[PDB]
Write a protein that binds this ligand. Structure first.
Ligand code: SF4
Ligand code: SF4
Ligand code: FES
Ligand SMILES: [Zn+2]
Lengths: 204, 80, 123, 111, 93, 688
């Protein structure tokens, strides 16, 4: 049939859903998810460094490269932040996701000794989300202003901000900051009634 | 000027309060015709006889787990 | 090693200016539309803040607002989770109970009644 | 078993004392090297009003996170980054605020 | 097309005369007000009513070239000519 | 114990016998696409869209029709169920015009949401498309019958619940027109709900017409004022303007419908309203002044006068926050003599005890009633939502309703027991047409209207209800927890004022004339130039000033029901909190802020800082208005009946007739709907 995509390598990739799980720590594994030839593993925050030393230079799983270090902010759970370490193997040609969970204000074990690229993405998470990282060298603000309040992404505060309007007013050199007036964002109440998808709805 | 009393649907603090509401309150309307005595309460809360004074004052008296004879005595002292 | 577990109420550290204490949150599940007869917007909690002053701008015709925290809708799975998140932010919340649809026995046999006055006239 | 950020209960307060000691010595550096702007005396008063807002000490985690945040927003002016008087001005001077009163706010336009 | 105000400024498509006490009139002092010469309201009545033989006719601008969704109009009523929701075009019989 | 185990896609679910396939699917979380079926309305298998295939069956059955028996595996996502939904959707849209841009319904449309998800991507259709001649139904409802999918839902609405009987199917096949054949101008109660009943853009609101699309307007929940029942309706705002008001589903407030006089009159709040504070000039006419200057002129008289010579007359569009603040400004600064606009009896413990002030029986409790012995009142004119509830209690369950006191047009039956106050006195004793039915009943309820109560025979009608109710319930009628007497207040503020501690009626102002009267939202004819025999100094504070506003010295502008965020009391006795949807126009302020600023300008200042501070002070005065959306029944009804019976009063000679006893009478009422472009157009066409 024309229009959908076919999958065949799902069973070959599902073996890692058993392989990493057969190492069997309550310290690491917890829950394993696999869909459309991609693996998602969510790992307890206490162990991150010993988890990422594995899958690195290991004979069966040789990743060595960290491409993305994205973070998911979600208010539904008690653990607010879901930091996703996206790894890519160049020897075996496969992608894996090392998910974690952190609450409002708890430090995670940062992967500075494991990955040399992590530190730049680690500064980005501390800016956008406010998730502090332990054993990190020089934690600095990159994207935010040098006098910025709050954390730019957090779903707690609005899209427009708080110190948005900047005048060149009566003071000769000083640019104004604390004025909070802006043009209104038309938040369209668009959400379609009737559930479009089966095998997703959960009973109360 | 008007007196107000809080009554609950629960058992504690309303065993003696409802007894004053059924036996004493019916006679209280006959005893004090000019002075308005309104006790309109049904929500689950701690009972209190918060009665307003003549002008620019309000005093609240506790009625939690009080005796039926003690409730009639406290209401008589508050009225004077 | 070294736990130092302390039990205390949540406080706002990464918080904006004095506007949290004045604004009140209304964590209430959104009601189904009058015209649209589908339940998908329901069964999910929404924490919408109370709307402040809005006026027509002298620049053109749009209605610009000074209030920053207004145009945000949050999602929650549980009523207890939404109440805990509101206390964590700092803002005072007024929670409303979810109005569940009552099960009414609507049978087709009632339309063609003999003794009952529930007989449907003209189809 | 549980994360502690940096310090446990008592030592976190001593870190604030360490932070206040360092930031009190940096206000002459933000006038002579940076720009005069206001005053040396008013600059030290700008410190006091910032810490008076943080009177709600309840957790070791909340205090330590504010210390780490304080070791960046006040560390910015030690190793001088681009601000040029327009940035790093915490005190509001351009805008005049309305006082909290039932007769004053209702006359102007609030809530 | 539209009637000129006693104040000075010309009225638009809708009756939009600025108030005498209103301060929003300084904008048109010096620089001219852009008011369209062709008014759409008068152009509806200007177009003649076309005659239909059959009961139901479908309205179109000019096929797929001129933008119009194909709407069928019922012509059972004798009084008041039937018009589509898009054009000001009217149909009889 | 009356439970059947069945499978939805192989998953176990327990259901009551008699329930439909769609009702069983709602339990697990599934929702089958529908067009005829409604939660409040009856069942019809017209459209045949809710097709769901159960295994081991040759034909696919509808979710509307079939009752669930033992052992069924209902397959929602089978090969045949998907083909059934895709098939019928193509039939529904084959003869339906391309009107989505010109359609009044946008994202809310049921055909749009379902055809995208369940229907096919492309249509086989080449030639056809029927066209339907539109019928002008009314000035309130715009009707384009070309878009109608002949679903038969409005026809069932007008017949079973509204009880008007005008809409009906005429013709066969394609040539079938929904509507009235005789071209009759359809105008009745609950007619502003038929626009929400219709799933497609066939029936729509004419006053609203074209302003915003469903996705564009931000929804906000609020309790509707100027109605006795107090229906919940989500008000939509499109950038600082109230565009449309649509009802939300609620168990207590009748059903999922709003009143016809409440829904259509959205433009009334926007047409005429006080923007700037107006004070009486030296010439005579009222002129616009500054907020600091206008308050100083009002405080100069308020602080000067002291004693019983200062009284406030408030009623109509008044809030609970306004009630707690005006009582704190009058009783504390001077002697308390505050009066209510609506007349209510207070001779035999009227204001005292919650059982006498408000209706004892719940608004949802009308369904579980054996016989309703209503007093001289019109349910069609006053509270259309309560009249629908009484009709639904009559349609679903067998219950004989009796209405004594002037015959009027009603949706139910008749069974009127004369038209006299003497007939009510005979009903208390061993009556011949009545009393016998009241004695042999499961749960009888007597509903006394405020329309007859606000007359010369106030205490006489109250004693007949207390004497009649006391002799019926206590003797043999009531068997446990059951209400006997009910009072439904016509005014919106009348139920709230009695609970707070306001003196009901204008008799308090008539007995002793005040020097300066601060009438908060004066609408009813109680205070006038002839009524007050001194220098006026009248202060008017309320939104939309047409009547009462010219006879005032210092008028201060206030916020409407959509503006101010404050609690409101229902007829049953429930506090519903309203949220602010739009900012007040001009220099107008909130009701709680207006009285607090007046105290701040004067010497004596009331303890209030914020909305939370005003809510805390309101909780201390009355705990019933503290908890939102929670109603509790009042105790000791026999004690209140004994105190009321002590007073002696003669019955009136004139029959108990309602002031509003017409279909056109319930269009322009209570002054709030009087200054409206939509209501005045409807009332003029009602006679013509
Ligand atoms: S009823 Fe729905 S599908 Fe039909 S024209 Fe209107 S919006 Fe479009
Ligand atoms: S007008 Fe609407 S509700 Fe009535 S039959 Fe047609 S589609 Fe159904
Ligand atoms: S919705 Fe069931 S047959 Fe139409
Ligand atoms: Zn056209």
């Amino acid at each position: 049939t024309v229009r959908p995509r076919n999958d065949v390598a799902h069973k070959q990739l599902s073996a890692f859903g058993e392989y990493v799980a057969e190492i069997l720590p309550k310290y690491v594994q917890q829950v394993q998810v696999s869909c459309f030839n991609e693996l998602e593993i969510c790992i307890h925050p206490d162990g991150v460094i010993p988890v990422l030393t594995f899958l690195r230079d290991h004979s069966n799983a040789q990743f060595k490269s960290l491409a993305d270090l994205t973070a998911v902010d979600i208010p539904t759970r008690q653990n607010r932040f879901e930091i996703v370490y996206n790894l890519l193997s160049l020897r075996f040609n496969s992608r894996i996701r090392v998910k974690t969970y952190t609450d409002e204000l708890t430090p995670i074990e940062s992967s500075v000794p494991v990955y040399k690229a992590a530190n730049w993405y680690e500064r980005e998470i501390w800016d956008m989300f406010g998730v502090f990282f332990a054993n990190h060298p020089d934690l600095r603000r990159i994207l935010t202003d040098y006098g910025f309040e709050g954390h730019p992404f957090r779903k707690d505060f609005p899209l427009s901000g708080y110190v948005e309007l900047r005048y060149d007013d009566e003071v000769k050199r000083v640019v104004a900051e604390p004025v909070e007036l802006a043009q209104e964002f038309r938040k369209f109440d668009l959400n379609s009634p009737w559930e479009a998808f089966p095998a997703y709805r959960q009973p109360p | 000027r008007e007196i107000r009393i809080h009554l609950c649907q629960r058992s504690p603090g309303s065993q003696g309060v409802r007894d004053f509401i059924e036996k004493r309150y019916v006679e209280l309307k006959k005893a004090n015709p000019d002075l308005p005595i309104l006790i309109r309460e049904c929500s689950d809360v701690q009972p209190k006889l918060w009665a307003r004074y003549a002008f620019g004052q309000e005093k609240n008296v506790s009625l939690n787990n009080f005796s039926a004879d003690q409730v009639t005595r406290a209401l008589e002292n508050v009225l004077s | 090693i070294t736990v130092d577990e302390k039990l205390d109420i949540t406080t706002i550290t990464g918080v904006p200016e004095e506007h949290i204490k004045t604004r009140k949150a209304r964590i209430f599940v959104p009601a189904r539309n009058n015209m649209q007869s589908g339940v998908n917007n329901t069964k999910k909690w929404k924490m919408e803040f109370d709307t402040r002053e809005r006026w027509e701008n002298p620049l053109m015709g749009w209605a610009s607002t000074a209030d920053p925290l207004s145009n945000l809708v949050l999602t929650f799975s549980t009523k207890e989770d939404a109440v805990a998140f509101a206390e964590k932010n700092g803002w005072s919340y007024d929670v409303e109970e979810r109005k569940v649809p009552k099960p009414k026995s609507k049978s087709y046999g009632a339309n063609f009644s003999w003794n009952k006055r529930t007989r449907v006239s003209t189809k | 078993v549980k994360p502690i950020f940096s310090r446990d209960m008592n030592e976190a307060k001593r870190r604030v004392r360490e932070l206040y000691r360092a930031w009190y010595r940096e206000v002459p550096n933000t006038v002579h090297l940076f720009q005069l702007d206001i005053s040396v005396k008013q600059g030290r008063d700008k410190v006091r009003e910032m810490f008076k807002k943080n009177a709600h000490i309840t957790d070791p985690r909340v205090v330590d996170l504010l210390v780490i945040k304080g070791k960046m927003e006040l560390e910015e002016t030690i190793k001088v980054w681009k601000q040029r008087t327009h940035v790093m001005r915490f005190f509001h001077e351009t805008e005049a605020p309305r006082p909290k009163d039932f007769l004053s706010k209702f006359y102007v336009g609030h809530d | 097309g539209v009637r000129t105000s006693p104040t000075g400024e010309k009225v638009t498509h809708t009756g939009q005369v600025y108030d005498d006490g209103d301060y929003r009139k300084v904008r048109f002092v010096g620089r001219q007000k852009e008011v369209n010469e062709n008014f759409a309201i008068d152009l509806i009545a200007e177009q003649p009513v076309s005659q239909v033989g059959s009961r139901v006719i479908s309205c179109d601008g000019g096929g797929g070239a001129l933008g119009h969704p194909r709407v069928y109009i019922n012509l059972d009523k004798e009084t008041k000519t039937g018009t589509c929701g898009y054009c000001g075009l009217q149909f009889r019989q | 114990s009356n439970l059947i185990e069945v499978f939805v896609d192989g998953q176990s679910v327990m259901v009551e016998p008699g329930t439909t396939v769609l009702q069983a699917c709602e339990k697990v979380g599934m929702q089958i696409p529908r067009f005829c079926y409604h939660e409040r309305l009856s069942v019809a298998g017209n459209c045949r869209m809710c097709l769901v295939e159960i295994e081991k069956a040759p034909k696919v059955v509808a979710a509307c029709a079939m009752p669930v028996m033992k052992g069924w595996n209902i397959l929602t996502n089978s090969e045949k169920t998907k083909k059934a939904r895709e098939g019928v959707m193509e039939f529904l849209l084959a003869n339906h015009p391309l009107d989505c841009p010109i359609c009044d319904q946008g994202g809310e449309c049921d055909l749009q949401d379902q055809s995208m998800m369940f229907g096919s991507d492309r249509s086989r259709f080449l030639e056809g498309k029927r066209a339907v001649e539109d019928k002008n139904i009314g000035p309130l409802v715009k009707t384009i019958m070309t878009r109608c999918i002949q679903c038969t839902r409005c026809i069932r609405f007008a017949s079973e619940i509204a009880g008007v009987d005008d809409l009906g199917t005429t013709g066969r096949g394609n040539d079938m027109q929904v509507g009235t054949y005789i071209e009759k101008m359809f105008m009745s109660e609950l007619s502003g709900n038929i626009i929400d009943i219709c799933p497609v853009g066939a029936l729509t609101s004419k006053p609203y017409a074209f302003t915003a699309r469903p996705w564009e307007t931000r929804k906000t929940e609020s309790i509707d004022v100027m109605d006795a029942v107090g229906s919940n309706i989500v008000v939509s705002t499109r950038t600082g303007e109230v565009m449309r008001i649509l009802p939300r589903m609620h168990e207590d407030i009748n059903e999922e419908w709003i009143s016809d006089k409440t829904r259509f009159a959205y433009d009334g709040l926007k047409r005429q309203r006080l923007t700037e504070p107006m004070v009486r000039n030296e010439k005579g006419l009222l002129t616009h002044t500054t907020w600091e200057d206008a308050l100083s002129r009002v405080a100069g008289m308020l602080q000067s006068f002291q004693g019983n010579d200062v009284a406030a007359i408030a009623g109509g569009l008044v809030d609970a926050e306004a009630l707690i603040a005006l009582k704190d400004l009058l009783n504390r600064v001077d002697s308390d003599t505050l009066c209510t606009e609506e007349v209510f009896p207070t001779a035999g413990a009227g204001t005292d005890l919650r059982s006498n002030y408000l209706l004892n029986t719940t608004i949802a409790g009308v369904e579980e009633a054996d016989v309703v012995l209503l007093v001289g009142t019109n349910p069609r004119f006053e509270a259309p939502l309560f009249n629908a509830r009484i009709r639904k209690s009559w349609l679903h369950n067998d219950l004989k309703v009796a209405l004594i006191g002037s015959p009027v047009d009603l949706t139910y039956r008749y069974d009127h027991l004369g038209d006299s106050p003497k007939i009510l006195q005979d009903i208390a004793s061993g009556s011949h047409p009545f009393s016998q039915v009241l004695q042999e009943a499961k749960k009888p309820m007597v509903i006394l209207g405020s329309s007859a109560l606000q007359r010369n025979d106030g205490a006489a009608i109250l004693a007949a209800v207390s004497n009649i109710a006391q002799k019926i319930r206590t003797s043999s009628g009531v068997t446990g927890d059951w209400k006997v007497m009910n009072i439904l207040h016509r005014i919106a503020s009348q139920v709230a004022a009695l609970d707070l501690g306001y003196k009901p009626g204008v008799e308090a102002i008539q007995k002793n004339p005040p020097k300066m009267l601060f009438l908060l939202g004066a609408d009813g004819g109680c205070i006038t130039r002839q009524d007050l025999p001194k220098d006026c100094f009248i202060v008017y504070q309320g939104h939309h000033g047409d009547v009462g506003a010219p006879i005032a010295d210092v008028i201060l502008p206030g916020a409407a029901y959509t503006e101010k965020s404050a609690t409101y009391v229902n007829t049953e006795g429930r506090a519903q909190q309203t949220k602010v949807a739009v900012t007040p126009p001009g220099l107008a302020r909130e009701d709680w802020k207006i009285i607090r600023a007046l105290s701040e300008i004067a010497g004596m200042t009331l303890p209030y800082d914020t909305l939370d501070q005003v809510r805390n002070r309101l909780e201390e005065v009355s705990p019933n208005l503290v908890r939102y959306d929670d109603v509790e029944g009042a105790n000791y009804f026999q004690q209140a009946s004994e105190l009321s019976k002590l007073v002696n009063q003669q019955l009136l000679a004139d029959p108990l007739v309602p002031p509003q006893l017409t279909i056109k009478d319930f269009y322009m009422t209570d002054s709030i709907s009087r200054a409206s472009q939509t209501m005045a157009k409807c009332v003029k066409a009602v006679t013509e």
